[PDB]
Amino acid sequence: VKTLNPKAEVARAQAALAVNISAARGLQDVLRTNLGPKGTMKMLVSGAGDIKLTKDGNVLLHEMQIQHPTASLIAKVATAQDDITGDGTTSNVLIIGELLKQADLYISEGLHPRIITEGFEAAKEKALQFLEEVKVSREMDRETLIDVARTSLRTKVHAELADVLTEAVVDSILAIKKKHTLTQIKDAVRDGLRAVKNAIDDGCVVPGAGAVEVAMAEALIKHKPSVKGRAQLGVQAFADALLIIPKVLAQNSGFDLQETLVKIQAEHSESGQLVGVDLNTGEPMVAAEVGVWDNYCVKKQLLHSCTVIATNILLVDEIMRAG
């Protein structure tokens, strides 16, 4: 009686949503500490023993031993998605880690994954709209590029090196247009060059410090009633998900990640100006005035990338052993 066994049966309908969501959440909780200034490096010891302080998303996801196959996916798809924008990882992995958690609530409540993702799509459209109406477009004078390079260099090195490299990167691009710590300085300079280049290319320096995450989540919630039926549960999980960046920004600076966010959401609702997270006192601050800028080429792609990856990892029924 040869060959009578129906093998290959794993992960039925939720058994795979649960696995993939837990893997995404683990990958989020690994990179959660490295976001923003006042973050935290990682070691990345090789086989020979070459340690490498590597506070960033690209070098980390591209070089660390990621055991879970789903997280290995999310990293192979997230690394290959930050060479068209320069650097927007460590925010992709987190936002995905909330599009997949804020959806687990409704999914466990009995919703179908392909109903949330419709809400994800509508929310992405409204978010791109609100981001195209919030871009502050100004001249790329040496003054502004100083800020757009300092905010992207303090992200990878402390304010000792990130206050002498800003000049060297804003004067190495204004002249072209028309050891375990040398790798770190090299990567930080290549990332400040890419940041100032993306700021020069389009001319939009849309505010940072999580201000646009807060202002993009609250406009969504004000837009939720006008979308559809159960689709609303996709714009209320894409709203509380573009809200960890301020939450984790506050968490990395030793603050309670619910009082600062509440103060920010209140001060944003009072004065109507998009307000961010001050990383020194925890009080809300106007990122446009203080002089912190993101790129309209990095947050325009942080939505596409996060939404695509999250929808794809929500749209899985079985995980089967191939050959």
> Which residues make up each annotated binding site?
36, 87-91, 155-156, 209-210, 294, 299
Determine, following the binding rule CB under 8 A, whether residue 14 of this chain makes contact with its own copies. no
> Under rule CB under 8 A, which residues in 208-237 are in contact with other proteins?
230
Decide: 288 and 136 in contact? Cβ < 8 Å. yes
Determine, following the binding rule CB under 8 A, whether residue 290 of this chain makes contact with other proteins. no
* Contact flags string 288-307 toward ligand ADP, x per CB under 6 A: ----x-x-------------
Distance CA 288, CA 281 (A): 17
Bridge partners of 285, per DSSP, are 276
- How would you class 7 by CB atoms within 10 Å of its CB: exposed for 0-12, middle for 13-18, buried for 19 or more? exposed
Decide: 78 and 24 in contact? Cβ < 8 Å. no
Question: H/E element holding 285?
Answer: strand 284-285
| Ramachandran region, residue 53 (left: φ > 0; alpha: ψ -120 to 50; beta: rest) | beta
Among 72, 172, 183, 273, binds other proteins (CB under 8 A): 72
Determine, following the binding rule CB under 6 A, whether residue 127 of this chain makes contact with ligand ADP. no
Determine, following the binding rule CB under 8 A, whether residue 110 of this chain makes contact with its own copies. yes
**Residues at the annotated binding site for Mg(2+)?**
87
Distance CA 292, CA 230 (A): 37
Distance CA 224, CA 68 (A): 35
Determine, following the binding rule CB under 6 A, whether residue 232 of this chain makes contact with ligand ADP. no
> Under rule CB under 8 A, which residues in 75-114 are in contact with other proteins?
111-114
> Under rule CB under 8 A, which residues in 151-210 are in contact with other proteins?
none
Determine, following the binding rule CB under 8 A, whether residue 138 of this chain makes contact with other proteins. no
**Residues at the annotated binding site for ADP?**
36, 88-91, 155-156, 209, 294
> Under rule CB under 8 A, which residues in 51-70 are in contact with other proteins?
51-53, 55, 60, 62-65, 69-70
Decide: 148 and 195 in contact? Cβ < 8 Å. yes
The encoded tokens of residue 229 equal 């039926």
**Residues at the annotated binding site for ATP?**
36, 88-90, 209-210, 294, 299
The encoded tokens of residue 146 equal 């100083």
Q: Three-state SS string across 51-86, please? A: CCCCCCCHHHHCCCCCCCHHHHHHHHHHHCCCCCCC
Of other proteins, its own copies, ligand ADP, none, which one does residue 38 interact with (CB within 5 to 8 Å by kind)?
other proteins
Determine, following the binding rule CB under 6 A, whether residue 118 of this chain makes contact with ligand ADP. no
Of other proteins, its own copies, ligand ADP, none, which one does residue 154 interact with (CB within 5 to 8 Å by kind)?
ligand ADP
Determine, following the binding rule CB under 8 A, whether residue 132 of this chain makes contact with other proteins. no
Dihedral Cα 268, 127, 145, 87, nearest 10 deg: 120
Provide, rounded to whole angstroms, the least separation between the CB of residue 66 and Mg ion: 21
Determine, following the binding rule CB under 6 A, whether residue 147 of this chain makes contact with ligand ADP. no
Decide: 198 and 297 in contact? Cβ < 8 Å. yes
Determine, following the binding rule CB under 8 A, whether residue 272 of this chain makes contact with its own copies. no
Contact positions vs its own copies (CB under 8 A): 105-106, 109-111, 225, 229-230, 232-233, 256-259, 262-263, 266, 269
Contact positions vs ligand ADP (CB under 6 A): 35-37, 39, 87-88, 90-91, 151, 154-155, 208-210, 245, 249, 279, 292, 294
